[PDB]
Amino acid sequence: GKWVIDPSELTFVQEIGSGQFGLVHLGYWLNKDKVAIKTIREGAMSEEDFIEEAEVMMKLSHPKLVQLYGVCLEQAPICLVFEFMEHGCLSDYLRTQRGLFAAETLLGMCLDVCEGMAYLEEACVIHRDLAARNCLVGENQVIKVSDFGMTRFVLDDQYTSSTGTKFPVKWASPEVFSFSRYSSKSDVWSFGVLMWEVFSEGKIPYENRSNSEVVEDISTGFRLYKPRLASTHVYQIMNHCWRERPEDRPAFSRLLRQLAEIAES
Numbered sequence: 614g615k616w617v618i619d620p621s622e623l624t625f626v627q628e629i630g631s632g633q634f635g636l637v638h639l640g641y642w643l644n645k646d647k648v649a650i651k652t653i654r655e656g657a658m659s660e661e662d663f664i665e666e667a668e669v670m671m672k673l674s675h676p677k678l679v680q681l682y683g684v685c686l687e688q689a690p691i692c693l694v695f696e697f698m699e700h701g702c703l704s705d706y707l708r709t710q711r712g713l714f715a716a717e718t719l720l721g722m723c724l725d726v727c728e729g730m731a732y733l734e735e736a737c738v739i740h741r742d743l744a745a746r747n748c749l750v751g752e753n754q755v756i757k758v759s760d761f762g763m764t765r766f767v768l769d770d771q772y773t774s775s776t777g778t779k780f781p782v783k784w785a786s787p788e789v790f791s792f793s794r795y796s797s798k799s800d801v802w803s804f805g806v807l808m809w810e811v812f813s814e815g816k817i818p819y820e821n822r823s824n825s826e827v828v829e830d831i832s833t834g835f836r837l838y839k840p841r842l843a844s845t846h847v848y849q850i851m852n853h854c855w856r857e858r859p860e861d862r863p864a865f866s867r868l869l870r871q872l873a874e875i876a877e878s
């Protein structure tokens with residue numbers, strides 16, 4: 614089928630950087646385009662579960678979502694082929710350009726991510742690991758969401774267990790760090806942390822807290838402070854994303870209207 618890419622259809626030009634459990638290269642895909650190619654090391658992911666879901670994932674086509682183009686599975690290590698995002702991760706894009714962006718621009722970056730997340734929410738697809746590190750920057754400074762649902766395939770328990778050393782506790786809602794209870798409402802909590810990373814120009818949330826300290830702090834009502842560039846209205850929306858009860862958090866469809874209201878007026 615079309616989703617399978619033959620090794621003869623790909624060339625590797627240069628490294629982009631280290632991804633999770635594998636290297637990412639810049640390359641070309643025959644008769645198509647420039648692409649980013651991930652080589653995944655053996656044992657890191659459930660390749661069979663991923664191959665079963667690949668065609669399904671490839672139908673989640675939205676301009677604010679980084680596209681999966683196909684899979685090169687002929688030989689180990691398998692390759693995953695994606696839409697190439699010229700300006701890389703949003704985390705480094707902000708950190709290297711501190712002082713450049715106006716709040717209107719930072720809000721527009723949050724609006725791009727929110728639009729991609731409202732599409733996934735309508736499709737009943739949970740991201741599970743939304744953070745600035747997997748939002749990528751493309752043409753005309755567009756931000757696109759990447760790696761939605763990919764943690765379903767990770768095999769290292771240090772990453773998947775809510776108590777594992779590499780679990781993204783900093784972006785987790787309490788029902789996720791307590792019970793791994795994923796939903797679009799737990800993605801909303803993560804989106805609030807993403808808004809904080811954006812308005813802080815790429816600062817690390819809860820920088821001097823261990824993961825166990827973040828659990829206790831969040832459970833006892835602590836919340837991230839307001840970034841200097843965030844207005845009080847922006848910070849109010851961040852706090853709505855961090856409500857303890859998932860039912861009290863806004864849906865992405867509601868956030869998209871609230872943030873656009875601020876952006877368009």
Ligand SMILES: C=CC(=O)N1CCC[C@@H](n2nc(-c3cccc(C(=O)Nc4cccc(C(C)(C)C)c4)c3)c3c(N)ncnc32)C1
Binds near residue numbers: 704749
């Ligand atoms: C800060 C520096 C930065 O910019 N980085 C870090 C190094 C790699 C860069 N990178 N990563 C991707 C990219 C985009 C989407 C998915 C993946 C992926 O491999 N999923 C992925 C593939 C297979 C398995 C898994 C598991 C989670 C299951 C382990 C994940 C990779 C990418 C792209 N398309 N265009 C440009 N650069 C890109 C991002």
